[PDB]
Design a protein around this nucleic acid. Structure first.
Lengths: 141, 197, 180, 33, 59
RNA sequence: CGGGGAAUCAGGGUUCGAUUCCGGAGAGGGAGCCUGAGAAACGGCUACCACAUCCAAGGAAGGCAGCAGGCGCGCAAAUUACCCACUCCCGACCCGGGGAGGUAGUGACGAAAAAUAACAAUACAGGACUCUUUCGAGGCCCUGUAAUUGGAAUGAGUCCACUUUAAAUCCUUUAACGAGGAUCCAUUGGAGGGCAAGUCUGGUGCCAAUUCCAGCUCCAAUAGCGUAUAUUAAAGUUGCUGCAGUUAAAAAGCUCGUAGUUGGAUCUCUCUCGGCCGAAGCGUUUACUUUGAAAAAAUU
């Protein structure tokens, strides 16, 4: 069991120190190498230049052909594949466009429907996709 | 090593940017072409084109006048052109060549319906860098000049979401406008960059 | 370095469970016969009660003859009697835990105007306070949630500069009489 | 859509109350921004 | 209701001694110079580049 | 950068503190100094290194991690405004000066209050009550709902004045005008698989099921509401309080063994000098508990 001596603070403190590392949530935030390989660099959003347009197939029990974009981030040069809200919203994106990109929603894990894509596009050419799709604004090219 | 590696990347990126900013408008590049487009019938374009004019070399045509401006102190060479909205082959032809568009705005409303038509044409073709100038904010009473500037920034926000409005009233503010136009990041259009024009 | 004060509070707390059928209906019942605008005026009165209840249960764990319990227990009970939520004969720290939200909401200026016969409904009371038709003692009040002390209860007058008070007719009556 | 149906019928096996099976069972309501 | 402060002086001479410059100017007993801070500050820095009586010649 | 301190909070904690108060360090990187009471001072000087301005090409000059402002970087942050009137500081000084500091501008970081209607009549629908066994009657009440009427009340605004203030603005006070679709028009999200809320409608195609799109109806919060990310609680999924290790993640192949941790019972004040006291060896040394002092405000 656990030692319950009055003068056992050093062993009780040192043991909890080492056993924290064995939780993967504690190691990711504290080792630092989970923020080095993060494309966002510990940020919440990131801007990038659109390279091309691609399509991603869905999972086996729910077959679909989802359409994504290949965007290269500015501040670190990494390539990420981002998701667009529908096929209708792809009309407002052309290559070599500056897009603001967020995460899809589960802190690093993919969509429950389509694998391989982890990021969603928020803005294109400094206007938002919600205002473009609802006809509130027009984008410059 | 981490600090030295960071300063090595910063030394690379700043020399790349310094090359690109110096190559336009300087002594080793083409003139910085500015197109001045009013967006209302209440804006006196010859009054605004008077304020922008360093030494001046005034070229002119049958109807319009496009003058060359050279600033030796500020080390920047200008080519100022103007275009009334509503004549499509006038505005669209010289905006696809321009590096900067200067929009002139009504103090009271945002822009005329003709200016609304012109903006839809420029947005679809492709904008270069743009700067918004309000021409007649001093004609209004001084009490409302804070209040009417508050109302104007609402009517602009439907199309230009987060952009500062300048003033074209005096020669001082004209000098502030030239420095803003000279030192400003340039929007690189994809089409005209790949071809020689 | 500025000569400013940055101290500020929140006067409400959102509940943990946002959608439960029992809490949604007890709150809607309180908005109904007290004429409130949102749930925030329910959660605000709920929050000011828990602050009092926390102060009561902190003093109760102290022993009876503790001089901080005697000073601040008497101070707390005097403040509740003064706003009229406690009876005079119920001055003890054990009776504080028997208060409810409805005792605090009954002391608002919106409720007192309806209870004093100055208005025809609880919603008519609220618009009458806001339109500068109600004064307390000699001071016009716009705030419906103004908590009325016992000394101000019998002095809720009816605004000498109002059409319903001294007698200067309103904009509508003046415009209408000009037609004929 | 077919993944929703097998999860509904699994809940039907568990005996809890379910909404009836209709045409609108698995349908995306609107795009999500 | 209205709350304010007031003060009554013994004479007009003592009022001109113990009062601020702005309160007398509200009554018309004092007039201030019309120079903005920029005109004084740029002139001040202009004559610190000049040594001698030519300080008084600065525009 | 440290600390006061912030968030969360049954209790124990966990996470944060570049940031207005206190201490430190620095002025592009290093180094050496002059003057002075006090500086290794950079809105002082002298060099080197890295940048960079003017030129008649010999030379001269520089340091915004001060207030604005610009470029760059970026997911990411405001005016090249007015004043020493307030608070204080400096000076030879009651007088001069202060981008310290104050006042306006931008400001949905966040926090507090709080409009977008109310009442009366008419018509239907429910619930009581009087008379009737009941159906039923109530110029009997009460409460709702209106493609129904009706004048009563008011702010939002436009715009004199007074007040405010260094001069203004805002608020507060008030003349005048200012509401029926009171069009002076409240949004943001979610629901037909679980928590609040769907036996819906119309286009689009596969061999009745079924890809995509546009709506209706309902629910929630409301001048606000979604999304991403970090973190706290949920988490008794880091466990001191307070978890586990047969079969689910896990106990070492066996024993000896330093440090560490833990360790059976037992034990009921005084001697001299000075006015009953004061000085003094104190009495084996502790840990524990209680009391007293001393401890910056602001925050709580």
């Amino acid at each position: 069991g656990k030692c319950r001596g009055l003068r056992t603070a050093r062993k009780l403190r040192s043991h909890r120190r080492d056993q924290k590392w064995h939780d993967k949530q504690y190691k990711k935030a504290h080792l630092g190498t989970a923020l080095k390989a993060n494309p966002f660099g510990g940020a919440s959003h990131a801007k990038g230049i659109v390279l091309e347009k691609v399509g991603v197939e869905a999972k086996q029990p729910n077959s679909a052909i989802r359409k994504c974009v290949r965007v290269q981030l500015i501040k670190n040069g990494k390539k990420i594949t981002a998701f667009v809200p529908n096929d209708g919203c792809l009309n407002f994106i052309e290559e070599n466009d500056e897009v603001l990109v967020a995460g899809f929603g589960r802190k690093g894990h993919a969509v429950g429907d389509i694998p391989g894509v982890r990021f969603k596009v928020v803005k294109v050419a400094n206007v938002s996709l919600l205002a473009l799709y609802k006809g509130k604004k027009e984008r410059p090219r | 090593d981490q600090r030295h590696r960071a300063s090595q990347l910063r030394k690379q990126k700043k020399e790349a940017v310094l090359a690109e900013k110096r190559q336009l408008g300087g002594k080793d590049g083409p003139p910085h072409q500015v197109l001045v487009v009013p967006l209302h019938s209440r804006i006196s374009l010859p009054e605004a084109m008077q304020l922008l004019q360093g030494t001046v070399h005034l070229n002119e045509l049958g109807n319009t006048q496009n003058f060359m401006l050279l600033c030796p102190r500020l080390k920047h060479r200008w080519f100022f052109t103007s275009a009334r909205p509503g004549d499509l082959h006038v505005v669209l032809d010289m905006a696809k060549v321009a590096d900067t568009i200067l929009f002139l705005l009504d103090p009271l409303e945002g822009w005329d319906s003709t200016g609304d038509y012109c903006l839809s044409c420029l947005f679809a073709q492709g904008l270069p860098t743009y700067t918004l100038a309000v021409q007649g904010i001093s004609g209004l009473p001084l009490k409302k000049q804070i209040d009417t500037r508050k109302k104007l920034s609402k009517a602009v926000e439907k199309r230009f979401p987060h952009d500062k409005l300048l003033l074209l009233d005096t020669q001082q503010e004209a000098g502030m406008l030239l420095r803003q136009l000279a030192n400003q990041k340039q929007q690189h259009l994809a089409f005209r960059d790949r071809r020689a024009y | 370095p500025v000569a400013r004060s940055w101290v500020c509070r929140k006067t409400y707390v959102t509940p943990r469970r946002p959608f439960e059928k029992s809490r949604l209906d007890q709150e809607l019942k309180l908005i109904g016969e007290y004429g409130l605008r949102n749930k925030r005026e329910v959660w605000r009165v709920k929050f000011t009660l828990a602050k009092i209840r926390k102060a009561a249960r902190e003093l109760l764990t102290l022993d009876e003859k503790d001089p901080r319990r005697l000073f601040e227990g008497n101070a707390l009970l005097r403040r509740l009697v003064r706003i009229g939520v406690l009876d005079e004969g119920k001055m003890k720290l054990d009776y504080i835990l028997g208060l409810k939200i409805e005792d605090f909401l009954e002391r608002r200026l919106q409720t007192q105007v309806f209870k004093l016969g100055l208005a025809k409904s609880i919603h008519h009371a609220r618009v009458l306070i806001r339109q500068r038709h109600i004064r307390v003692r000699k001071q016009v009040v716009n705030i419906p949630s103004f908590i009325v002390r016992l000394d101000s209860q019998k002095h809720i007058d009816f605004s000498l500069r109002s059409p319903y008070g001294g007698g200067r007719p309103g904009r509508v009556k003046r415009k209408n009489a000009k037609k004929g | 859509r077919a993944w929703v149906l097998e999860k509904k019928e699994r809940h039907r096996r568990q005996g809890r109350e379910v909404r009836p099976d209709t045409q609108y069972t698995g349908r995306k309501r609107k795009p999500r921004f | 209701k209205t709350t304010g402060f007031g003060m009554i002086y013994d004479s007009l001479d003592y009022a001109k001694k113990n009062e601020p410059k702005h309160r007398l100017a509200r009554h018309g007993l004092y007039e201030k110079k019309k120079t903005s801070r920029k005109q004084r500050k740029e002139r001040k820095n202009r004559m610190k580049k000049v040594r001698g009586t030519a300080k008084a010649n600065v525009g």
